[PDB]
Amino acid sequence: FDDNRTAESTDTNTISRDKNTSETVSEKTGTKDNTFDS
Amino acid sequence: FDDNRTAESTDTNTISRDKNTSETVSEKTGTKDNTFDS
User: Fold this and answer.
1) How many CB atoms sit inside 10 A of residue B12's CB?
2) How far is Cα A16 from Cα B2, in angstroms, rounded to an integer?
């Protein structure tokens, strides 16, 4: 959540709002095999 | 999801909402062989 309020005087008041929401999901699987012979 | 609402006075209200979706699929594959002699 972020809000900003700007105003100037010598009267052109400016107000802004914005919504940032995000989610990420990730599933990682692996498999490693090895054989040795001495 | 993120929504932005803003207005100014002295109205010109502005509404802008965004949607973004991503999906990355990765494939890993490898092979490593080695020999030793002494």
Assistant:
1) 8
2) 13
Asked if residue B6 lies in contact with residue A15, where contact means CB atoms within 8 angstroms, the answer is yes
3-state secondary structure of A10: coil
Q: Which residues of A touch B8 (CB under 8 A)?
A: 12-15
Contact residues, A window 5-34, toward B, CB-based 8 Å cutoff: 11-22, 30
Query: Residues A17, B6: contact at Cβ < 8 Å?
Result: yes
Give resolution in angstroms.
3.6
Contacting residues of B for A17, CB less than 8 Å apart: 3-6
Q: B3 has which bridge partners?
A: B17
Residue B17's DSSP bridge partners are B3
